[PDB]
Paper text:
Among these, group 21 allergens including Blo t 217, Der p 218 and Der f 219 identified in B. tropicalis, D. pteronyssinus and D. farinae, respectively, are known as mid-tier allergens in the allergic response. The structure of rDer f 21 adopts a bundle of three anti-parallel α-helices similar to the group 21 HDM allergen Blo t 2116, and group 5 HDM allergens including Blo t 514,15 and Der p 512. The crystal structure of rDer f 21 revealed an elongated dimer structure with molecules A and B interacting in a head-to-toe orientation. Helices α1 and α2 form an intermolecular anti-parallel dimeric interface while the C-terminal α-helix (α3) is fully exposed to the solvent.
The structure of rDer f 21 bound to a molecule of PEG 400, rDer f 21PEG400, was determined to 1.5 Å resolution from a crystal belonging to C-centered monoclinic space group C2. The structure contains two molecules per asymmetric unit forming a rDer f 21 dimer. Each molecule of rDer f 21PEG400 is approximately 60 × 17 × 14 Å and forms a coiled coil bundle structure composed of three anti-parallel α-helices denoted as α1 (A14 to T47), α2 (K50 to A78), and α3 (M85 to K113). Structural comparison of two molecules A and B representing the asymmetric unit of the rDer f 21PEG400 crystal structure shows a significant structural deviation localised at the α1 helix of molecule B between residues 20-30. The r.m.s.d. between the two molecules is reaching up to 4.3 Å. The dramatic conformational changes at the helix α1 of the molecule B are caused by the binding of a well-ordered PEG 400 molecule (from the crystallization buffer) in the pocket of the rDer f 21PEG400 molecule. Interestingly, the coordinates of other residues surrounding the ligand binding pocket including F23 and Y66 are well conserved. The conformational changes enable binding of the ligand into the dimer interface cavity, an event which may otherwise be prevented by steric clashes. The binding cavity consists mostly of hydrophobic residues including A70 and three aromatic residues F23, F73, and Y66. The PEG 400 molecule in the cavity of the rDer f 21 dimer interface only forms one hydrogen bond to Y66A (residue Y66 of molecule A) and is further coordinated via several hydrogen bonds with water molecules in the cavity. The lack of direct hydrogen bonds between the PEG 400 molecule and the surrounding residues suggests that the cavity would prioritize a hydrophobic ligand.
Numbering used by the authors:
A (entry chain A), B (entry chain B): 1 to 117
Write the structure that this text describes.
């Protein structure tokens, strides 16, 4: 049942496949949540709701914390000495995708904090 | 739309709900992977397959790295200064659930390493 170690084009390890599939799903969910928070931000510019402002900031903090933990996992697996082409590509891509999303979150946080409430 | 901050019986934060709503189910899937590896270990005791031994160890190394990180994360969430009754219970329970899996993984790793291959 074992994937040959010489395979270059697929996940050789079952836990890599499982965990990376769940990570990818979470990144899609976070990107969508950020889009929803951006739209709440648009409402906040008009209403100046203190509760909405504080809540968006809480959400952004939660997402950031999660992504920082994910990033540590990805960077650590990316330092593996035994990495095939497919695995290296998937881990390096994940690192890139997270680092971008962390930036997008921090940018929304800045806009939200700028709302005089 | 926002959950009142005084609510005690649910996730107040959407990103907490997103991250945690299927948590215990996801951990069940890790537990199941550990079961499959335990059963492979029983085959290994008979065959003494070097490849099977190494592959079980690789899988447990990946799961260990994931869980050590998830544990540290959940322990920090349980230190939040604003936690309601439900949020605290769920974070604390998650810490316990992860601790159990970490212990089971370390025990299996020890038995697998001992197979003289």
């Amino acid at each position: 049942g074992l994937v040959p170690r010489g395979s270059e084009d697929k996940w050789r390890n079952a836990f890599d496949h499982m965990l990376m599939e769940e990570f990818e799903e979470k990144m899609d969910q976070i990107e969508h949540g950020l889009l929803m928070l951006s739209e709440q931000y648009k409402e906040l510019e008009k209403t100046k709701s203190k509760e909405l402002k504080e809540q968006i900031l809480r959400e952004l903090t939660i997402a950031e914390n999660y992504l920082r933990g994910a990033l540590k996992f990805m960077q650590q697996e990316a330092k593996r000495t035994d990495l095939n082409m497919f695995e290296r590509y998937n881990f390096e891509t994940a690192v890139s995708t997270i680092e971008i999303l962390v930036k997008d979150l921090a940018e929304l946080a800045k806009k939200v904090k700028a709302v005089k409430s």
